Design an enzyme around this catalytic site. Structure first.
Site, mmCIF file in Angstrom:
data_model
loop_
_atom_site.group_PDB
_atom_site.id
_atom_site.type_symbol
_atom_site.label_atom_id
_atom_site.label_comp_id
_atom_site.label_asym_id
_atom_site.label_seq_id
_atom_site.Cartn_x
_atom_site.Cartn_y
_atom_site.Cartn_z
ATOM 1 N N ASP A 280 -55.108 -92.621 15.162
ATOM 2 C CA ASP A 280 -55.688 -91.925 16.301
ATOM 3 C C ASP A 280 -54.696 -91.065 17.085
ATOM 4 O O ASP A 280 -54.972 -90.777 18.258
ATOM 5 C CB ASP A 280 -56.253 -92.959 17.273
ATOM 6 C CG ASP A 280 -56.782 -94.206 16.591
ATOM 7 O OD1 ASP A 280 -57.497 -94.066 15.543
ATOM 8 O OD2 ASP A 280 -56.507 -95.300 17.130
ATOM 9 N N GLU B 136 -57.386 -95.424 8.061
ATOM 10 C CA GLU B 136 -57.793 -96.180 9.240
ATOM 11 C C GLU B 136 -58.769 -95.368 10.097
ATOM 12 O O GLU B 136 -58.432 -94.963 11.173
ATOM 13 C CB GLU B 136 -56.577 -96.627 10.039
ATOM 14 C CG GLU B 136 -56.873 -97.887 10.854
ATOM 15 C CD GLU B 136 -55.766 -98.198 11.841
ATOM 16 O OE1 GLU B 136 -55.809 -97.606 12.998
ATOM 17 O OE2 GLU B 136 -54.852 -98.945 11.433
ATOM 18 N N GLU C 71 -56.689 -90.883 22.619
ATOM 19 C CA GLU C 71 -56.796 -91.431 21.271
ATOM 20 C C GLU C 71 -58.231 -91.420 20.726
ATOM 21 O O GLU C 71 -58.417 -91.189 19.526
ATOM 22 C CB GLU C 71 -56.257 -92.861 21.185
ATOM 23 C CG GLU C 71 -54.735 -92.965 21.062
ATOM 24 C CD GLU C 71 -54.022 -92.771 22.385
ATOM 25 O OE1 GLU C 71 -54.698 -92.659 23.398
ATOM 26 O OE2 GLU C 71 -52.793 -92.635 22.365
ATOM 27 N N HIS D 34 -47.176 -110.356 24.684
ATOM 28 C CA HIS D 34 -46.555 -109.152 25.243
ATOM 29 C C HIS D 34 -47.569 -108.392 26.089
ATOM 30 O O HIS D 34 -47.174 -107.382 26.662
ATOM 31 C CB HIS D 34 -45.978 -108.240 24.142
ATOM 32 C CG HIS D 34 -45.139 -108.983 23.147
ATOM 33 N ND1 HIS D 34 -45.578 -109.318 21.886
ATOM 34 C CD2 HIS D 34 -43.906 -109.552 23.297
ATOM 35 C CE1 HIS D 34 -44.639 -110.031 21.271
ATOM 36 N NE2 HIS D 34 -43.595 -110.194 22.128
ATOM 37 N N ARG E 90 -49.729 -107.259 29.153
ATOM 38 C CA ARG E 90 -49.531 -107.125 30.591
ATOM 39 C C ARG E 90 -50.326 -108.207 31.327
ATOM 40 O O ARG E 90 -49.805 -108.808 32.277
ATOM 41 C CB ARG E 90 -49.927 -105.708 31.041
ATOM 42 C CG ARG E 90 -49.498 -105.385 32.464
ATOM 43 C CD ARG E 90 -49.342 -103.886 32.699
ATOM 44 N NE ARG E 90 -50.626 -103.215 32.824
ATOM 45 C CZ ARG E 90 -50.908 -101.980 32.386
ATOM 46 N NH1 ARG E 90 -49.963 -101.206 31.842
ATOM 47 N NH2 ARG E 90 -52.150 -101.527 32.512
ATOM 48 N N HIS F 42 -38.003 -111.073 25.070
ATOM 49 C CA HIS F 42 -36.924 -110.748 25.995
ATOM 50 C C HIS F 42 -37.353 -111.096 27.420
ATOM 51 O O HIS F 42 -38.457 -110.749 27.817
ATOM 52 C CB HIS F 42 -36.551 -109.261 25.910
ATOM 53 C CG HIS F 42 -35.391 -108.900 26.778
ATOM 54 N ND1 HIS F 42 -35.493 -108.669 28.132
ATOM 55 C CD2 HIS F 42 -34.071 -108.816 26.448
ATOM 56 C CE1 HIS F 42 -34.273 -108.447 28.626
ATOM 57 N NE2 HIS F 42 -33.373 -108.517 27.589
HETATM 58 C C1 LIG Z 1 -41.647 -107.370 18.766
HETATM 59 N N1 LIG Z 1 -41.940 -108.798 19.055
HETATM 60 S S1 LIG Z 1 -42.313 -109.924 17.929
HETATM 61 O O1 LIG Z 1 -41.089 -110.435 17.408
HETATM 62 O O2 LIG Z 1 -43.201 -110.865 18.533
HETATM 63 C C2 LIG Z 1 -43.187 -109.027 16.691
HETATM 64 C C3 LIG Z 1 -42.648 -108.320 15.598
HETATM 65 N N2 LIG Z 1 -43.615 -107.746 14.862
HETATM 66 N N3 LIG Z 1 -44.814 -108.079 15.473
HETATM 67 C C4 LIG Z 1 -46.053 -107.635 14.899
HETATM 68 C C5 LIG Z 1 -46.332 -107.883 13.561
HETATM 69 C C6 LIG Z 1 -47.549 -107.507 13.019
HETATM 70 C C7 LIG Z 1 -48.456 -106.813 13.785
HETATM 71 C C8 LIG Z 1 -48.177 -106.572 15.120
HETATM 72 C C9 LIG Z 1 -46.975 -106.990 15.689
HETATM 73 C C10 LIG Z 1 -44.600 -108.859 16.595
HETATM 74 C C11 LIG Z 1 -45.686 -109.382 17.484
#
Ligand SMILES: CNS(=O)(=O)c1cnn(-c2ccccc2)c1C
Ligand SMILES: CNS(=O)(=O)c1cnn(-c2ccccc2)c1C
Lengths: 369, 369
Positions: free
Chosen positions: A98, A120, A134, A207, A209, A240
């Protein structure tokens, strides 16, 4: 004379989504000349991914989107892609999702009377301003597309509802799932994995909000109760932290070395770690679509899901953000080997790892190759 | 505080189709601030039509078309249209039809969150390369539009099937019909009419490319027989001369003094001459939708039609491309007053001269003004 297929990599998250498709194109060197164009601003992670997949870009454009107006991106991207298409003369241009770049990649193709395949396709909000731009991008790209590669029946239905030609709409599944047979390596090491034994791994990500504050505290309190009740379980939380949010974690969890707060993982390490997980707790849309293909039950730290098909198939369960609900559902699955194995074996409805095969087949058919 | 309505005139033919809408907007000075933005390169006649309508542009951009590429017109247009929309900040932008300028005007509006009212909306061939780029422009404009003003049920239905909001789809009629109340003068002088005197005029229009070859030769043979069977008839064919025509003409038409091949007419001359015509032979879609509101029977020089509504209403008859049916149908209308008067008094399904009224009423209601 070979069919010239140009694949665009326009943003970093497309590396994982489009690299499997390029790899599949590269398995037909007799019928297909695969041409790769990268226009993404940020390159380190993408280049890492293209190399894992043994892909060498044929064209690199720098299309800046740091503090840049839609207008400037649109005009400069249209120029840039038009030039690439006048030179490389693809028979078809494949574009993802998108983005403004997908929209102008399609417009440039149209302006050279070159067919477009939309990877997609069919996600609809029906709200032209949410998301912005988008939703409009995927509609604009929708009218220009010759082939529509829908990850799910719902997306295909959306396109049918807009009176698109059914013969041009393919339910392929989600190409990100296809990546997993490349990215997940049996011989793979991580510090976090060494600390874990034949211990069962709970991988947790949040992650969103909306999960700041109380929801995080509820999660941490639930995790505490889980590692106290299940002595063979370690938990990994790659995020983090603000110092004060760190202090909150430590206060609730203590330092008993079976809960590892670590820095965020790159996609590759994430894939490999997720693949060795016993359970996943997430607020990520994409993990909901992908992690089940690894045979990992997914508990979704939200009250509602935008992934109704995972719920239906029993690859996903809603856990809410209440301490009690998160503890309740995670505990069920860590207690009852039968109920874990069940979700672990349920089929991922977002694909079976052959989306790229279906895309390539559909392209070869359409072009009488 | 007045609704700020920007009407765009991107081309000379749009002048006639959008001037009546502006006149209508200017009849609501308490509620509406009519802003007229002209983007055409060639203004002579556009200014002529503007003058007759009593319209003074507020904004003038020079989007150069002649020998310019789609890309160049697209980038410069989008820049200039964005700039003017930040400058004026209109509450809605009105755009006509299937020009590249309509498309980019719609994108510029979308990039500023400004609603788009699409005049003459819903026309579909579903062939993205015929016409090119007009089919795609109107599809692109269509996904971006907030309000759709379809000339006919057919075009309104095309939008419904594309899953557009039925509450935003209005069957207004063709605003060109609206224009005739203004362009057609009770008294008018032109060489054609001086030389006509009290003879009955047959007015022929034919595109040269699609009637190239046997068609035009067949039309010529037919008009020759018409003037041979009817002493009080003159045939006038406005055409851009080329010794091809001259030879074709002199070979078949001869020099008997009642068939005049003249230089193409400007729209005002055309309307005023058509308004004094006994019969029209045409392959023009516009003439099919406009001339009947002047009470002129219209024979269509095509074996196939995309305007079935006029056929069914009795304002049009298919004459074909073959000599004998062209002759036979024109001869009839010239030989039988009843047959002429029947077609002449038939109600024009493409509009009743009040399309602009309906368009402005929709805008006002949409904005609860
Ligand atoms: C960046 N933080 S993390 O380590 O939690 C991480 C790394 N890859 N992903 C992720 C993998 C597949 C689809 C969407 C996201 C996450 C959630
Ligand atoms: C250019 N040749 S011409 O003089 O026969 C002429 C002038 N105006 N028109 C015209 C009028 C209304 C709708 C569409 C077209 C024609 C066909």
């Amino acid at each position: 004379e070979r069919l010239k297929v140009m694949t665009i990599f326009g943003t970093r998250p497309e590396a994982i989504k489009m690299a499997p498709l390029v790899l599949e194109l590269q398995k037909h060197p007799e019928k297909i000349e695969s041409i790769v164009t990268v226009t993404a601003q940020h390159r380190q992670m993408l280049d890492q991914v293209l190399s894992i997949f043994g892909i060498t870009p044929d064209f690199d454009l720098n299309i800046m989107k740091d503090r840049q107006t839609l207008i400037d991106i649109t005009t400069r991207g249209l120029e840039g892609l038009d030039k690439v298409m006048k030179e490389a003369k693809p028979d078809i241009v494949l574009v993802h999702g998108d983005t403004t770049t997908t929209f102008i990649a399609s417009l440039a193709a149209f302006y050279n009377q070159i067919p477009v395949g939309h990877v997609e396709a069919g996600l609809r909000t029906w709200d032209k301003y949410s998301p912005y731009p988008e939703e409009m991008n995927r509609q604009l790209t929708g009218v220009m597309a010759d082939l529509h590669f829908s990850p799910t029946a719902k997306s295909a239905t959306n396109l049918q509802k807009e009176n698109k030609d059914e013969s041009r709409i393919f339910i392929t599944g989600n190409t990100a799932i296809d990546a997993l047979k490349t990215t997940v390596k049996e011989t793979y090491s991580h510090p976090v994995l060494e600390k874990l034994g034949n211990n069962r791994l709970v991988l947790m990500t949040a992650h969103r909000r909306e999960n700041l504050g109380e929801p995080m505290r509820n999660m941490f309190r639930a995790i505490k109760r889980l590692v106290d009740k299940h002595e063979d379980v370690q938990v990994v939380y790659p995020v983090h932290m603000n110092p004060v949010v760190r202090e909150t974690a430590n206060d609730i969890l203590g330092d008993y070395g079976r809960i590892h707060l670590i820095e965020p993982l790159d996609v590759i390490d994430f894939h490999n770690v997720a693949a060795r997980s016993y359970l996943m707790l997430t607020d990520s849309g994409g993990v909901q679509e992908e992690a089940p293909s690894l045979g990992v039950p997914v508990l979704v730290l939200r009250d509602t899901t935008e992934r109704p098909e995972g719920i239906e198939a029993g690859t996903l369960k809603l856990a809410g953000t209440d301490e009690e609900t998160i503890f309740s559902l995670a505990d069920e699955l860590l207690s009852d080997k039968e109920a874990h194995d069940k979700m672990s074996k349920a089929s991922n409805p977002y694909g079976d790892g052959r989306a790229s095969e279906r895309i390539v087949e559909a392209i070869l058919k359409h072009f009488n190759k």
